[PDB]
Amino acid sequence: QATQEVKNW
Amino acid sequence: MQRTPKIQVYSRHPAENGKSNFLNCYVSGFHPSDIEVDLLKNGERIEKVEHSDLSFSKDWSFYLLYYTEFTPTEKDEYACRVNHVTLSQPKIVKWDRDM
Amino acid sequence: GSHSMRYFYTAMSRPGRGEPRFIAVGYVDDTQFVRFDSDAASPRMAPRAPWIEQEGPEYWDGETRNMKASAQTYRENLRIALRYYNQSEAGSHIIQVMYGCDVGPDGRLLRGHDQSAYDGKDYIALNEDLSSWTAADTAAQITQRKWEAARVAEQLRAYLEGLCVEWLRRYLENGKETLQRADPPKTHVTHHPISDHEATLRCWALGFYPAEITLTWQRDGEDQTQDTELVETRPAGDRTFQKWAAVVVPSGEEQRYTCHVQHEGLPKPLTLRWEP
């Protein structure tokens, strides 16, 4: 299962 | 900042004339990811070739497997033809059943 | 033995040819099991291994929702990267990401990974502590400061120690017939004269899984590292891999050469020679 993005660059 | 593809042309199983097999063209080590690959039979493009999903190595360079079913014979010549931004002209690598 | 799970993202801008393409693939060891492509007619997280197909619609809908959101995030990150490198909106650029977890034979976390690149060069990496970052340049230091302020590492650590290893353990069990089976290489040496006084010996390894292998030539028991031609390990297309190693030898000296093969499917390393 993939993880979710937390913050942009 | 660009890396030219390495190219290997080979079969899934040891080649036996008249026995069905898969012809593989493995392109790797290249960057950026856009790349044009044709498999050729006696110089002509084979239709409906399939390819793997784009992935990449620990050094960020990309790799792809192109493949098609084929039945090798004594006289038929196979190759894969590759174009990439790093190449002035398409590179043709002939299938050598001992490589 | 030990196992890994990895997700690989590639986001590629293409000004004048639409929004950036986003492709994600997931692997367990050397076995791909999912894919997502934003250019597909109907983009979805889709199965690529038989043992993942049994996951239910909640799984597939959640993975698809995440991938669509991640594609949007990386489209935003490509625009941000232009500002960080003083680049124009005319050129094509690529962000790559790889992340995931390694477990030991007992299923416990061995180490976690979360590393990114811009245009094929290291950008930022989560350190092995899963708490601090290594930035490759002053642009990635801007990202580092943002991610330190937002405690991003804590959230990634929670994934890497938790859901990452839990799902990996589940996949290993559901795919135990293949993911937990090593296939040893089938090996042989071929001989090709080059001239009247030199010949090529080529040591072949075929049909093996996983891809990690060592093929070495020795001459009189001494490794021939600087004199060996070694091709990149290549996929056969049936989950297996192939590799060969070649040396050019003086005619009449072939029996002084031995090929050595190490692979996790072999109980012991193998020694082979040309058999005329």
Numbering used by the authors:
A (entry chain C): 1 to 9
B (entry chain B): 1 to 99
C (entry chain A): 1 to 276
Question: Can I see the authors' text?
Answer:
The S3T mutation also induces the same conformational changes for the presentation by B57, following the same way of propagation. However, without an arginine at position-97 of B57, two more water molecules, W5 and W6, mediate a hydrogen-bond network to stabilize the E5QW9_S3T buried in the antigen binding groove of B57. In summary, despite differential residues in the binding groove of the two alleles, the structural data indicate that the S3T mutation induces a similar peptide conformation change in B57 and B53. Therefore, differential cross-recognition of QW9_S3T by B53- and B57-restricted QW9-specific CTLs is unlikely to result from structural differences in the peptide presentation but likely from structural differences in the HLAs which select distinct TCRs. We did observe notable local structural differences in peptide-binding between QW9_S3T-B53 and QW9_S3T-B57 due to the sequence differences in the α1 helix of the two molecules. In contrast, for B57, the long sidechain R97B53 is replaced by a short sidechain V97B57, and the short hydroxyl group of S70B57 forms hydrogen bonds to the mainchain and sidechain of N66B57. Conversely, S70B57 likely adds to the stability of variant peptide bound to B57 and may contribute to B57-restricted CTL response upon the viral mutation at a polyclonal level. Employing differential scanning fluorimetry (DSF), we measured the thermal stability of QW9 and QW9_S3T bound to B53 and B57, respectively. Whereas QW9_S3T-B53 manifests less thermostability than QW9-B53, QW9_S3T-B57 is as stable as QW9-B57. Thus far, attempts to generate a QW9-B57 specific CTL clone for similar biochemical and structural TCR analysis have been unsuccessful. However, QW9-B57 and QW9_S3T-B57 dual-tetramer staining of cross-reactive CTLs demonstrated these B57 restricted TCRs have comparable binding affinity with wild-type QW9 and QW9_S3T bound B57, across a range of tetramer concentrations.
One such highly networked epitope associated with control is QW9 (QASQEVKNW, HIV-1 p24gag residues 176-184). QW9 can be presented by the disease-protective HLA-B*5701 (hereafter B57), but also by the typically disease-neutral HLA-B*5301 (hereafter B53). Here we examine the CTL response to QW9, a highly networked epitope presented by the disease-protective HLA-B57 and disease-neutral HLA-B53. To explore the molecular underpinnings of differential cross-recognition of QW9 and QW9_S3T restricted by the two HLAs, we next determined the crystal structures of QW9-B53, QW9_S3T-B53, QW9-B57 and QW9_S3T-B57.
